[PDB]
Amino acid sequence: YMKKAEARLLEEQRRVQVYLHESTQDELARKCEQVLIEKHLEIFHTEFQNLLDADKNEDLGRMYNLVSRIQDGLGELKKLLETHIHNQGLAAIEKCGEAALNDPKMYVQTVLDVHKKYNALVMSAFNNDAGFVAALDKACGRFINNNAVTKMAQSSSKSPELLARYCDSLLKKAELEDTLNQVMVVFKYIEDKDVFQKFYAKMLAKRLVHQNSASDDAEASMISKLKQACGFEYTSKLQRMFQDIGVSKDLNEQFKKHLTNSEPLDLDFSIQVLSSGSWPFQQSCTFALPSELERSYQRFTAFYASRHSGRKLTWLYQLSKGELVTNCFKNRYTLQASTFQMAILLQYNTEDAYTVQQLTDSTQIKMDILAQVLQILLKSKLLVLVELKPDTLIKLYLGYKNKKLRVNINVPMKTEQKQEQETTHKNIEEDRKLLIQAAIVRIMKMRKVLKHQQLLGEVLTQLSSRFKPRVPVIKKCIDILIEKEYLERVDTYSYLA
Amino acid sequence: RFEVKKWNAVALWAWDIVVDNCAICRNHIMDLCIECQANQASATSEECTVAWGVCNHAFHFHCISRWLKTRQVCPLDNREWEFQKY
Amino acid sequence: SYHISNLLEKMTSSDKDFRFMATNDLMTELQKDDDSERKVVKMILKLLEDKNGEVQNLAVKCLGPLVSKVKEYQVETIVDTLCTNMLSDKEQLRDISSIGLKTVIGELAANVCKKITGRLTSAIAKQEDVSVQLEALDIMADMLSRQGGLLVNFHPSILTCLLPQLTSPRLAVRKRTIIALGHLVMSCGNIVFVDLIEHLLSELSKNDSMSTTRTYIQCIAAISRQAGHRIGEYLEKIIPLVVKFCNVDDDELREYCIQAFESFVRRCPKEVYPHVSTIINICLKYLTYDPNYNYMSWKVRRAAAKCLDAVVSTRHEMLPEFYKTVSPALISRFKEREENVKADVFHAYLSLLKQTRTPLTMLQSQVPNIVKALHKQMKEKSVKTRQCCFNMLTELVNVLPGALTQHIPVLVPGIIFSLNDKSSSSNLKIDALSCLYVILCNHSPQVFHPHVQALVPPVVACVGDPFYKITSEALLVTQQLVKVIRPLDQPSSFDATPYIKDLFTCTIKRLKAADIDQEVKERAISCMGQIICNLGDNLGSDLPNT
Numbered sequence A: 001y002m003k004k005a006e007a008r009l010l011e012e013q014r015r016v017q018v019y020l021h022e023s024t025q026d027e028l029a030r031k032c033e034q035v036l037i038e039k040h041l042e043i044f045h046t047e048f049q050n051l052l053d054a055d056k057n058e059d060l061g062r063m064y065n066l067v068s069r070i071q072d073g074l075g076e077l078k079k080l081l082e083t084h085i086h087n088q089g090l091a092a093i094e095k096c097g098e099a100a101l102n103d104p105k106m107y108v109q110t111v112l113d114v115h116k117k118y119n120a121l122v123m124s125a126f127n128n129d130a131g132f133v134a135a136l137d138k139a140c141g142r143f144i145n146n147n148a149v150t151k152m153a154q155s156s157s158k159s160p161e162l163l164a165r166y167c168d169s170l171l172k173k174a175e176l177e178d179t180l181n182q183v184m185v186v187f188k189y190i191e192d193k194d195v196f197q198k199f200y201a202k203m204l205a206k207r208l209v210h211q212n213s214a215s216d217d218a219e220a221s222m223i224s225k226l227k228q229a230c231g232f233e234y235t236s237k238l239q240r241m242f243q244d245i246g247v248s249k250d251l252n253e254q255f256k257k258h259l260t261n262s263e264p265l266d267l268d269f270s271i272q273v274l275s276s277g278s279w280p281f282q283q284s285c286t287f288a289l290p291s292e293l294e295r296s297y298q299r300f301t302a303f304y305a306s307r308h309s310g311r312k313l314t315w316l317y318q319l320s321k322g323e324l325v326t327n328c329f330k331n332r333y334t335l336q337a338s339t340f341q342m343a344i345l346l347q348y349n350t351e352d353a354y355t356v357q358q359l360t361d362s363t364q365i366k367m368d369i370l371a372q373v374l375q376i377l378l379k380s381k382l383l384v385l386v387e388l389k390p391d392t393l394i395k396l397y398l399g400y401k402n403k404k405l406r407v408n409i410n411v412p413m414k415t416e417q418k419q420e421q422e423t424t425h426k427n428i429e430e431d432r433k434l435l436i437q438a439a440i441v442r443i444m445k446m447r448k449v450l451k452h453q454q455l456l457g458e459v460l461t462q463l464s465s466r467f468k469p470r471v472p473v474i475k476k477c478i479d480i481l482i483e484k485e486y487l488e489r490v491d492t493y494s495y496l497a
Numbered sequence B: 001r002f003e004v005k006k007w008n009a010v011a012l013w014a015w016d017i018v019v020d021n022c023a024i025c026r027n028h029i030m031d032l033c034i035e036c037q038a039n040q041a042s043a044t045s046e047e048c049t050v051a052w053g054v055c056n057h058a059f060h061f062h063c064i065s066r067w068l069k070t071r072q073v074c075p076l077d078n079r080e081w082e083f084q085k086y
Numbered sequence C: 001s002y003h004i005s006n007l008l009e010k011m012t013s014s015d016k017d018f019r020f021m022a023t024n025d026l027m028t029e030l031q032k033d034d035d036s037e038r039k040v041v042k043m044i045l046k047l048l049e050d051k052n053g054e055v056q057n058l059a060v061k062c063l064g065p066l067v068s069k070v071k072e073y074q075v076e077t078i079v080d081t082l083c084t085n086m087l088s089d090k091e092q093l094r095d096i097s098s099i100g101l102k103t104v105i106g107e108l109a110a111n112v113c114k115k116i117t118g119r120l121t122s123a124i125a126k127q128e129d130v131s132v133q134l135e136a137l138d139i140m141a142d143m144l145s146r147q148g149g150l151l152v153n154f155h156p157s158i159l160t161c162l163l164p165q166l167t168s169p170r171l172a173v174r175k176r177t178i179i180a181l182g183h184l185v186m187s188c189g190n191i192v193f194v195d196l197i198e199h200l201l202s203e204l205s206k207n208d209s210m211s212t213t214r215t216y217i218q219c220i221a222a223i224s225r226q227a228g229h230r231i232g233e234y235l236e237k238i239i240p241l242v243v244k245f246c247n248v249d250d251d252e253l254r255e256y257c258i259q260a261f262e263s264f265v266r267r268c269p270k271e272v273y274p275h276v277s278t279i280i281n282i283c284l285k286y287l288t289y290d291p292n293y294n295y296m297s298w299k300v301r302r303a304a305a306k307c308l309d310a311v312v313s314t315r316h317e318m319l320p321e322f323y324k325t326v327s328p329a330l331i332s333r334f335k336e337r338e339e340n341v342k343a344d345v346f347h348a349y350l351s352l353l354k355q356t357r358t359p360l361t362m363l364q365s366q367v368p369n370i371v372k373a374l375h376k377q378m379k380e381k382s383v384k385t386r387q388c389c390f391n392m393l394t395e396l397v398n399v400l401p402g403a404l405t406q407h408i409p410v411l412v413p414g415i416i417f418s419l420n421d422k423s424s425s426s427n428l429k430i431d432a433l434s435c436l437y438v439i440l441c442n443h444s445p446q447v448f449h450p451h452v453q454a455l456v457p458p459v460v461a462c463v464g465d466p467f468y469k470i471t472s473e474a475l476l477v478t479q480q481l482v483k484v485i486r487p488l489d490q491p492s493s494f495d496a497t498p499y500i501k502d503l504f505t506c507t508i509k510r511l512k513a514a515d516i517d518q519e520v521k522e523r524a525i526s527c528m529g530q531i532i533c534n535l536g537d538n539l540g541s542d543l544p545n546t
């Protein structure tokens, strides 16, 4: 029927131009458009949904062309499209199941596919109209922030976390640029961007320290894109890490050149010296450094004392890794392990059995971490004697090997990832309160007397870029500044200098 | 027996002019503030955390917050103070 | 007048909050005097170098609204100072000024572009420093992308400096130069395009190094993607050279030239007609290229598979040749060890089938081979591989309604296995049920009579899954199964008594729930209506209550 109406409309123009007067063109066109389109709008609206369900782009294009001739006739189609896109996004996310909660790639790719399909549909069929792209943007913003995955996590901050975890998987060890651009497209619709930024910084730190980046060009591309996406403070905060790594490379080279003057180190030694303030890492637990490693510790401490007298070092033993070679096995094989595993593996060389409670005193490792790393050791099948018993004796399993020449026994701990996520989520919440307090202080500094609603509006418009503050937390911040004597009440507040 | 071939270590550097203590108040950096200790436990005591700066100088958050009401200069350090970590 | 002066005074308050709020207030005022304009412009430039970061961010964002209101002459010296700041020795100033220039170009008349390009052209040529090259290339690409047609007089000047950069040791310079070249070709004169194409051909003819030929092949692909129709007249010389390059041993070089063929096949259809046979032959010959394993080079296989899809999806008038020569190869290559290549070959064959909507008899002749391959492919552990087979069957049945008449005994157990497998996910189950529904709808009822005993239990189990999406498809399949077990329009000797209670009991629970979603209710009503209509006589006391 749309084809028939489109043909009839052109026939009418031909007729009126050929053998009528030119003053009838407006009236004939209006009457024909009325009788052919405006009287069947309910049928057109019903057919729109069915054409959306079974993808038929040409039919949708013809419907858009026909209904665009009626004044205020495109309004219902926009609402229908918005509802359809929102439902499609929610359904697509829901079919993934519980796996999307721990698989960033699937979760991000589903959203990317849903966005791409309807973006192409809008660009092709609807002639890239502003009203339709507005509906697409609203629908995407709705279903990205709230969906089934966020309900399971009981928070709307899980989506930025999953996006940041997908970026890290992409950038770890031609087409990558396109998917990075798609990720930046998705990042536009996120309400809580500080959650994304903190996680991205925390994973870039791990990538830089452990030297497990794919290529530096991809890192530069991400920095450049985040420059246009985010502001300038975040970019400088990230650049400080690169500057520290660059400085540490030169310092390590200078130490390596200078080491040959004295007796050479029996083992290969590389160091990464980082500024405490810039990097997110925390202080290490108490530890008894192994005797085999004391010389390198003392030599570097003395050297760095001479290079810079003012500064003092603070070693991190939960991020240091090395290589080990064994001759007690059936065949000599080299293995890679962390410093803690080295300490609780170099503890015995000829001794076969040790008690966990007895071995604890020598290494001085805390019991909580010690047990958890013993599960990692036992699962490696390289050690043998599922809850722990302090009186258990552990004995080496001789005559055990693996198919590969080398084995990597540096496996992430079972609970460490969950604890890291929880701690980061708590730090984000604390930082939000600190930023709100700072914003209130600045507003009171600029304006001596202000009202409650005006203050709330100013805080909301100042912090809207990063996150959307809740009203109760702003009032709580006002109360906490009341106790701190920054401002005092006179519904109206005044700065007390 | 086992032997070690390669070891990669990570370390962090900070100013040693401090004794691992705040400069504004002579308490150990992990402990609470003088105002926090003298006063009773409240919501203010819950928000006591060490704060760093671009100059890599570490003080209590409350101490530097009190100090910055009148001045805008780091205590041990004549450059302007900016926040970078909590 | 007086109001702006107070802000200008507070921007030097030596306090962070006062500077921040003064800049914010000025930005707000601009969004909503000759002497005052100069002071504001100088202060924003001075704040670009402030110690604090938030003040710097506000100063950068202020440059946008500032240029629109202030007179044109001031914009000239703003551009001058920013371009000078790019070449400054200080590292942070270059970064902070680059964003400023990008914002100024974004919020933008013809004179400022000419002022910018003069510095940019000299900045790109600096071979000693690479960071300036990278940022200058980015800025020039942004400038050409938006409002780039105005600089008609500077196109040869821009091209004279870009072509040397394609031999740079840094691979990022080449990648950022290709984008600028494409944006230049997007809107330019006819004389410059001829020079660019001639230079690329001359460089390719005298291949200096392996890394150089890759770069020019990528440049040809990119220019074909953007320019499109304009390069069609020059394909007669492009194709033979690339075909000769395709035989080089380098694995990487093959992928780029296959992608180059794909761009010519897709972007410009008219001029590529003679060489379609050569492109198809090359893609077929390299589709089976595994020089290591017999029954690091999966990229070339993927490229060949994608180029075949590009060829098939466009040329409608080549179906007799398609089913003659490309169809047997794709079916034979359903056994790819890598999943990524297998997905590509499945997508290509699906594109062929969608195009097929005489071809029909040739497809019906090839159906047995497709069934033979899919029978082996439906036993795989991976969910993704199994998921493509059902989309294969659905499209095949849709194109040919009675295609699978002779292969129901071998196709039913494959569906049954995926229906009740524990490792299967929701998407696989939904696709299997959808395929079963389409198979049942488009075949004679007498075929499925032996297999009803096998089909009923898994479907009944699927009606009771906690996830409602599976339940909806299960009810839809149950409706057609009810129509199949006892048709009312034709005579049947089949006995349907044992399954009546099995279907009724599972349907009635969903009918009377009062807590399920809309779709499940709307499908339960429809399924129960069909049950009553076809097999209501055998139901006992349940019908009056229902």
Ligand SMILES: [Zn+2]
Pocket: B022, B023, B024, B025, B026, B027, B033, B059, B060, B063
């Ligand atoms: Zn203190």
Ligand SMILES: [Zn+2]
Pocket: B032, B033, B034, B036, B048, B049, B060, B062, B063
């Ligand atoms: Zn305190």
Ligand SMILES: [Zn+2]
Pocket: B053, B055, B056, B057, B074, B075, B076, B077
């Ligand atoms: Zn300081």
